[PDB]
Each structure stands twice: as C-alpha cells, then as structure tokens.
C-alpha cells in the first residue's frame, strides 16, 4: 500500500451509499403506506408522471403495459418490465424528483414505492411497505431477464467465413430516411452539418 487516502467515517458512508440490492441489502428502517405515497406523489411527482403514475405527455410512464412485451410497440414500466423492487426504492431515493433529487426521506421513499406498487395493480390501497416486508414483494417480470448470451447465439454464426464475391443478397431499396424527414436541417434543407460546397463562395 502507498498510504494515500484516509478512512471514511460512518456518517460519510451513510450519506453516499444508499444503494439497495435485490435481496434487500442497503434497506434502512422505515415504512410508508399507499395513501401517504399518493399524497407525496401528488406534491412531488404527478406534475410529470401523472396522478396515477400513468405519465403526462412524453414523460415516463410508471404504471401500465402489462403483457405488452411481445407487442409491436412494448410499454415497459415498473409493473410490466422491471425485475426488482429494490431498484424502485433506490432510484427514486437517489435521483427523483427530476431537477431536485435527494429530497425524499426514507419513509417518504417507502410510501412512494407502496403507491407505485398500488398504481401497477400489485397491492391493495391499504398496503404498508416496510424494511421488514420489502423483500416479500416479487414483481411480475422478476424472471424476465438473462445474462448476455451473444457468445452462444450470435458470435458463432457471425464468425463464419463471409462471402466476398457474387453474394446472394437482395439489393432493392426498401426504406429511405428522407421519407421521414425528421433530421435537423441547414437553411438550404440539407442535413444539418453538411459539408460546405467548395464550388460556392466561402461563408462570412
């Protein structure tokens, strides 16, 4: 060891390490109910995420989309998609509200998490979330993920000897970005940042 740094104090660790792991490591003592969460959500969150956590305008939807994961356009929310409740608590506590993060107490965060469960149809309106019962909650998509398997499912296929000559591929144009016309433009209508025409006069 080089002898650099100094020992972190308990107060310092407590202030910065608020991560919660899926098995409940990192949970702190506290509780909150759905009704309290609703009130907190109204005051601090509904302005973006809706009174029922359903989203306003284009802000994130926090409830809904159950069973949509094989639809043409899935709706991925806490209830339809997230695997663990730990993530809800942790992310809310650390990073919301957007623009004024880290203003929620431990109890406030339990209450809000209870309300998000209720809004996703996962608990009744009298539910109380505590540090003791937190890990009893299992989200619908808990078993919906698996570690990267490209090494089994893609790399062998894509590491085959590729074709160089007279390759049997289709070359008919099927999609064109210009059909959408949703790229920023320069004043002349070209894609923004297009190279200047060196045959025309240089810009002032």
């Amino acid at each position: 060891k080089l002898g650099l740094g100094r020992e972190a104090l308990p107060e310092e660790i407590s202030a910065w390490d608020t991560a919660v792991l899926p098995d409940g490591q990192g949970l702190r003592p506290g509780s909150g109910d759905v009704a309290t969460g609703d009130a907190l959500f109204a005051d601090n969150c509904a302005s973006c995420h809706g009174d029922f956590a359903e989203g306003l305008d284009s802000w994130p939807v926090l409830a809904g989309g159950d069973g949509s994961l094989t639809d043409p356009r899935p709706v991925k929310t806490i209830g339809s998609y997230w695997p663990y409740l730990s993530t809800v608590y942790d992310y809310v506590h650390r990073s919301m509200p957007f623009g004024s993060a880290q203003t929620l107490s431990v109890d406030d965060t339990y209450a809000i998490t209870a309300f998000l469960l209720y809004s996703n149809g996962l608990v009744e309106d009298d539910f109380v979330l505590t540090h003791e019962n937190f890990t009893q909650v299992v989200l619908p998509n808990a078993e919906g993920f698996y570690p990267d398997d490209r090494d089994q499912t893609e790399y062998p296929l894509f590491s085959k000897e590729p074709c160089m000559t007279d390759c049997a591929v289709g070359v008919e144009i099927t999609k064109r970005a210009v059909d959408l016309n949703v790229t920023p433009e320069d004043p002349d209508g070209r894609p923004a940042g297009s190279m200047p025409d060196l045959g025309a006069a240089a810009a002032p």
Partner: protein, 389 residues
C-alpha cells in the same frame, strides 16, 4: 487558358500580417469549419438534460476525436465539479473504506489507454428502418480519446478488497448517479479512473475531473464525475442495468449485462452530409471501424449493396478496442452505388447485416445495433441512408 487571379494577383494574406501569437491563448477552429460541431436532435428525448448529442464523424478523419466536438450523453446534465470539491469514496466489502481527494489521486501510478466510448444506443433509432440522415446522427454517439489515469486495481488495493467482494458498483456525483455494476474480473483487468483525455483534463461534459474508462464496454458504464466505488457480493441491479441497458428479445424476455460493444463500421464519406460534388473520377471512401472484442483485422467495402466486396486498407494502427480508420480509393464512373462497409475483428467476428441481427433479436432491442450501414449514392452525387433487401 485564362490565368487564375487567385494566383496572378497578390492576395492580402501574402502581403499584410496575419494574427499575432498572443491573440488566442486557447484557440478554436477557424470559422469556415463551423459545421464540424455537435448536433442535437430534439425529438429523441423528453428533456435536454437527459439526452444525447452527436459527434460530427462525417467531417473528421483519422481516429482521435477532438474533445470539443466529442458527443455528450447526460441524465441530469453536465455538472460543474471542481478538483477542490471532488471526493472519491471506496467502501463496502473492503478492509478499510477510504476517501480520496483529487490531490491524492494524482499521486498513484498512472496508466494509459486509447479507447472508443460508444453509447449503447448508437444507431438504436435505426433498428426498425432508416430514420435519420447522416452518419453523424446514425453512428455519431461515439468518441475516441487517449486517456491517462490510474487503474482501479491500484485504488482498490489501497482499501483492500475482501474475499466476499465480487462486484464493483460505480456512481457519479450528479443527481442521476448513473450507478452501474461491474464484475471484479473486468475491474481488475483494464478499467481506469481517467483524469486526462487527449492530453488535457477531461472536459466538464465528459466527467471533469474524473471518469471511468471501460475499454470495449457500452458507454453507459463509463461513469462520469465518479464519486464512489462500492464493493458488493452481488450486482446492484440499478435502474441503468434493469429498466435501461437491457435488450428486449422476440419472446418477451430481455438480455441483461450486455456489456461488450461488438465489431462495427461506417463509411464516413461519401455519406448523406458529404455528397460527391466533384464529378466522376478518383474518389476517396473513408470510414471508421471498431470492436469491443479486440483489434480490427480488416474492413471490406462494397459498392453494390453487398453482392461483391473489396478489402480496404487500414490507415494507421488497429489498436484494441479503439477507432480504426479505413480507406478505399476508387474511380467513380458516375453510376449509382450502394456503399457498405463490414468490419472483422481478431476473434473472427464479422459485422452482421441489420437483417441478420433482426432475425435473432427482432426489432425492439433498442441497444447494440452494429448492423451494416448502406448508403445509396445517386447519379447527382447525393447520398441517402437506406435499407436494402
């Protein structure tokens, strides 16, 4: 012929003075190069502080990205964090949890790497078709810099990783935190806490004064403004590795922990922002190739939509997990072309077509689109983003 007055008449710059050596202590590009800048596509996101901008890769050459136009991706904006206010904590399953100042960090043994930072979402808007016009937009969530910093192994050695410690969780000083979990094997390999990029301190928007550099791995893991390294016995499964940076598959399950960025390439010119205005004859095809799985070994170029391929040359070195420049010189007869490039890396992996990827993954992966890009070069020299089939 008629003599050109730009030669036969003396021009002011060949008679009068230019600017003095004291005019610009820290300079910017000449004004004629104003198009070589970041671009922002408003519709892609809900807020400009949790959003993305795009490196002008259509206009660049070589491999080093000028840091002033190197893309940004933030989730709660680019924060101002002085070296005086900076603190780095190491805690968790360690023998002694530690707090470092920036001064302390400048005293550890240093290392270097040159590495691409590619956003997991680069090209993601192209998963379902051809949407944006220009490689700045469809491939420009990338930058490539020479980093200098300290290996995480040496910092962790100072704290003393306990036998139970299996994962490192890194989080930033910003409101968003961007917490991500890393297996210890990667941490101890080549993850760096970088302080310098392309010679000088990190730019504010790139994590000043300290960021993680995670060679070959998706950009989200390159935690900026890094404040804490926690050692745990399991992955945290934070928002940025559950809700986000997970890759939905056709059966409704999703891959998680898709850390590596696979071999990829793009022709930067000709491209939609770089039309051929000079007529028939010699034409330089230029582009970039890279792989998170090692060194690029070759790049093949097609002029006919993948029916026939010619091996390009690599210009410069092919460093591991770094941008690599390729060129093919042709004699353009003015015919329409369908340009493609296809990277190969040292593992033998060959960059797939978009169709080959979708045949496995479907259309809702969001991330990790390394599919072959096609440019339709028209007889007027204009160039389009297309799909072909």
């Amino acid at each position: 012929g008629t003599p050109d007055p730009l030669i036969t008449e003396i021009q002011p710059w060949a008679s009068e003075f230019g600017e003095a050596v004291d005019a610009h202590p820290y300079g910017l590009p000449i004004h004629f190069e104003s198009h070589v800048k970041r671009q922002y596509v408003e519709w892609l996101t809900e807020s400009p502080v949790s959003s993305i901008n795009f490196t002008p890769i259509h206009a660049l050459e070589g491999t080093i990205t000028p840091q002033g136009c190197a893309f940004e991706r933030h989730h709660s904006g680019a924060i101002e964090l002085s070296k005086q206010d900076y603190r780095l904590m190491i805690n968790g399953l360690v023998e002694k949890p530690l707090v470092f100042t920036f001064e302390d960090l400048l005293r550890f043994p240093r290392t270097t790497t040159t590495a691409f930072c590619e956003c997991a979402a680069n090209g993601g808007m192209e998963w379902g078709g051809a949407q944006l016009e220009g490689c700045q937009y469809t491939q420009g969530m990338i930058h490539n810099m020479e980093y200098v910093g300290v290996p995480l192994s040496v910092l962790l050695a100072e704290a003393g990783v306990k036998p139970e410690g299996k994962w490192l969780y890194a989080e930033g000083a910003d409101a968003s935190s961007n917490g991500r979990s890393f297996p210890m094997e990667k941490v101890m390999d080549d993850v760096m806490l970088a302080f310098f990029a392309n010679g000088e301190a990190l730019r504010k928007e790139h994590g000043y004064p300290a960021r993680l550099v995670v060679p070959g791995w998706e950009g989200n893991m390159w935690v900026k403004w890094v404040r804490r390294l926690g050692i745990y016995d399991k992955a945290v499964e934070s928002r940025e590795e559950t809700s986000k940076y997970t890759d939905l598959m056709p059966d409704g399950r999703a891959r998680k922990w898709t850390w590596v960025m696979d071999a990829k390439s793009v022709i930067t010119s000709p491209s939609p922002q770089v039309p051929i205005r000079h007529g028939k004859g010699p034409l330089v095809i230029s582009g970039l190739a890279w792989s998170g799985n090692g060194r690029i070994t070759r790049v093949d170029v097609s002029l006919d939509g993948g029916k026939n391929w010619t091996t390009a040359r690599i210009t410069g070195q092919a460093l591991p997990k770094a941008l690599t420049r390729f060129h093919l010189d042709i004699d353009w007869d003015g015919s329409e072309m369908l340009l493609q490039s296809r990277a190969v890396d040292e593992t033998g992996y060959v960059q797939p077509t978009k169709d080959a990827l979708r045949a496995i993954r479907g259309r809702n992966n969001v991330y990790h689109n390394n599919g072959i890009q096609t440019w339709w070069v028209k007889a007027d020299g204009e160039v389009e983003n297309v799909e072909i089939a």
